[PDB]
Structure 1
Amino acid sequence: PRYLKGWLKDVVQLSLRRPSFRASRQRPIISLNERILEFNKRNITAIIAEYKRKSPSGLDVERDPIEYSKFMERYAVGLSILTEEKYFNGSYETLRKIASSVSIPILMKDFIVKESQIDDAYNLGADTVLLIVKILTERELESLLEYARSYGMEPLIEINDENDLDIALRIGARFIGINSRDLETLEINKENQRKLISMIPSNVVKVAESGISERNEIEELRKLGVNAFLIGSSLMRNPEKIKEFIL
């Protein structure tokens, strides 16, 4: 990885020592980005529901994974499951169980720094994976992307600034997530996010991440060309809220 400070440095060390998951994939790869594109064509708001009982920017919310999943399977274009243990209280089992209960695409949200973590996602049932530009080097980012593509997955490559955007385009990314929240400081900056969104070529599928609480934010981001929206916190407290962003 790159040189990191604070929690990002710690979570990365945990991830390097994260034990591999040994079992075989049951389900098929259900492409998330392609499903986002089809929803776009059918003019259905594409929302990615995130399941996380804990995070650095929030209070803990206990909720049953399977129930959340089965309910979202009716509304969301896909699911984003946190599997990072320490700061997000996620686990592999929770993903394994959910992947078996639903048939919509699943994104494994974790701090992927080695290839075995992509093997895990594959074996656990995830259809795709999140790659974070700021913790990885250009070389690493390129290999992991290629390694995920060999599995038939198109990773969601998360950016946060122009530096990140440059690299993302350079390594040939086609599925990018613009995070409004700076992972390091946990600060949200929507102006910077709208700036980046307009610098991304029309052909790449754009997912807006973080800071969405109202349906009109979605409509505005949408006129800017954003394809999908990843919403977590608000949905964990009141799942039903999805019916409101979705109309």
Structure 2
Amino acid sequence: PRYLKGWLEDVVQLSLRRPSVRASRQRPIISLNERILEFNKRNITAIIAEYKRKSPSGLDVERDPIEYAKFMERYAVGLSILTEEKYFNGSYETLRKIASSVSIPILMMDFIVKESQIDDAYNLGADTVLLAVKILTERELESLLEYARSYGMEPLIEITDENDLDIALRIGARFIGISSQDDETLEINKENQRKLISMIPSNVVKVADSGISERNEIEELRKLGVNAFLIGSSLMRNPEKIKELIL
């Protein structure tokens, strides 16, 4: 990993010692990026609904993961499921139980710094993983990228700014998350978002990873080439909001 400060450095070091799982995968990859493209052609708003109990910058939420997942299954293009333990109060078991309960694509949301974490995601039933440009050296980023690919996963590669983007494009990310959040400082910046979206080639599947709040905004971004939308905290508080966003 790169040089990091504060909680991010702590979560990286901790992630390096994450115990691997020996579960076996009992179902093919249902590709997230391909379903998003499917939804785009049928003109269905593609939302990746996120299950997140806790985070350093947000509010704690206790709720039944299975009820949440089964509800979202009706509406979302996929699910994002936090497996980071210390800061996000996630679990491998939650992902495992969720993935066996639904048949839409699942994305494991964690801090992936070693190969066996990608083994965990596959073995647990996840269909893809997120990789952070910020936490990995460019070399680590590309090795884990291809490691993901060897399982048949196209990873969501997260960028926050143009420095991250130059890297993601150089190495040929086909599936990119434009996040308004810098993980290290925890600062949120939505104004760079559209400028960044404008710089991505039309062949990459683009995810807007921010608190999208209304249909008008979704329609605008959609005209700008955003393919899908990752929504977490607002759905964690009021799940049925997803219905109004899609109509």
TM range (shorter): over 0.9
Tell me, yes or no, if the aligned pair for 2:37 and 2:227 is still in contact at 8 Å.
yes
For residues 1-60 of structure 1, the C-alpha deviation after alignment (integer angstroms, 9 at most, x for no partner) is: 000011110100110000001121111100000000010000000000000111112121
- 8 Å contact 2:80–2:108 — kept in the other structure? yes
Q: Give the CA deviation at 1:105.
A: 0.1
What CA distance in whole angstroms lies between the structure 2 residues aligned with 1:218 and 1:56?
Answer: 26
Query: Does the CA-based 8 Å contact 1:46-1:77 persist in structure 2?
Result: yes
Structure-2 separation of matches of 1:55 and 1:149: 28
Mapped to 2, the partners of 1:194 and 1:137 lie a distance apart of 26
Deviation of 1:215 (Å): 2.2
CA offset at residue 191 of structure 1? 1.2
Structure 1 residue 122, shift from structure 2 partner: 0.4
Q: Separation in 2 of the partners of 1:131 and 1:246?
A: 27
Matches of 1:39 and 1:102, distance apart in 2 = 18
Task: Tell me, in whole angstroms, the C-alpha distance in 1 between the residues paired with 2:133 and 2:171.
Answer: 11
**Are the counterparts in 1 of residues 211 and 232 from structure 2 also a CA contact under 8 Å?**
no
C-alpha displacement of 1:211: 2.5
Find the aligned partners of 1:8 and 1:2 in 2 and give their Cα distance: 11
3-state DSSP class of the match of 1:198? helix
Three-state SS of the structure 1 residue aligned to 2:100 is helix
Alignment map for 1:63-142 (pairs within 5 Å): 63-142=63-142
The Cα shift of 1:98 comes to 0.2
Question: Matches of 2:59 and 2:196 in 1, distance apart?
Answer: 29
Distance (whole Å) between structure 2 residues aligned to residue 60 and residue 215 of structure 1 = 26
Q: Number of paired residues?
A: 247
2-side partners of 1:173 and 1:118: how far apart? 17
Structure 2 stretches lacking a partner, 5+ long: none
8 A Cα contact 1:181 1:211, kept in partner = no
> 1:14, 1:210 → 2: CA distance?
26
Please say if residues 177 and 206 of structure 1, whose CA atoms lie closer than 8 Å, have aligned partners that are also in contact.
Answer: yes
SS in 2 for 1:206: strand
User: Structure 1, unaligned stretches of length 5 or more?
Assistant: none
- Kept in 2: contact 1:118–1:129 (CA 8 A): yes
Q: Match for residue 13 of structure 2?
A: 13
The answer on whether the counterparts of 2:197 and 2:226 sit within 8 Å (CA) in structure 1 is yes
TM-score, normalisation: structure 1: 0.99
Question: Residue 161 in 1 paired to residue 161 in 2?
Answer: yes
Q: Which contiguous aligned blocks of 4+ residues in structure 1 show a shift greater than 6 angstroms? A: none
**1:49-101 superposed Cα distances (whole Å, 9 cap, x missing partner):** 00011111212111100000000000000000000001100000000000000
Q: CA deviation at 1:213?
A: 1.9
Q: d(CA) in 1 for partners of 2:59 and 2:70?
A: 24
Contact 1:188 1:211 in 2 (8 A): no
TM-fit CA distance, 1:185 = 2.0
- Residues of 2 paired with 1:57 and 1:233: CA distance? 11
Aligned mates of 1:221, 1:185 — CA distance in 2: 26
**How big is the shift at 1:216?**
2.0
Q: Structure 1 residues 9-18 or 178-187, which shifts more?
A: 178-187
Q: Which residue of 1 aligns with 2:2?
A: 2
Distance in 2 between the 1:51 and 1:211 partners?
14
Q: Distance in 2 between matches of 1:182 and 1:244?
A: 28
How far apart are 1:125 and its partner, in Å? 0.4
CA distance in 1, matches of 2:216, 2:19: 42
CA contact (8 A) 1:27 1:125 kept: yes
Structure 1 SS opposite 2:236 = helix
